Amino acid sequence: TYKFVNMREPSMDMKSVTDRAAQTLLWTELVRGLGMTLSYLFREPATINYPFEKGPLSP
Amino acid sequence: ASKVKQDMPPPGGYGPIDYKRNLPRRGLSGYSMFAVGIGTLLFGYWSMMKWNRERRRLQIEDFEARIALMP
């Protein structure tokens, strides 16, 4: 079985075209990326305090 | 005596794992966004209308005072 990754056709009604124009002019997806980064700032980092803390190992 | 003991999945298997793409749509129409922009523009225009007319009156008053002092 196989899937299509980029086989969508954008709608050409007035509402869809207006939505795409609003995206182009007001930079909505750029704001979405900014929001993702902003949210990702307010979470705890993954850094450990070497050499006072050490990475996990195995026997 | 002891039976075999090695790394095996628990009985009944593991819990289902999500793999589908999850890109939710936040939700706000382009008409609504344009309406918000136009509304804030109009509100700013009206406020600055009022303030600039008041500033014109203040400047006229200052000019009146200067005219009175000139001779």
Ligand SMILES: CCCCCCCC/C=C\CCCCCCCC(=O)O[C@H](COC(=O)CCCCCCC/C=C/CCCCCCCC)COP(=O)(O)OCCN
């Ligand atoms: C009733 C009377 C009203 C009078 C009419 C007024 C109505 C106004 C309606 C339109 C206003 C919109 C203008 C805003 C600028 C739009 C310019 C634009 O859309 O250009 C983009 C380009 O925009 C960009 O790509 C810029 C991205 C740069 C990265 C910056 C990240 C954006 C987020 C940062 C926050 C922005 C903060 C803004 C406020 C700053 C305050 C000082 C088009 O490029 P493409 O989509 O690639 O298509 C071109 C091929 N045909």
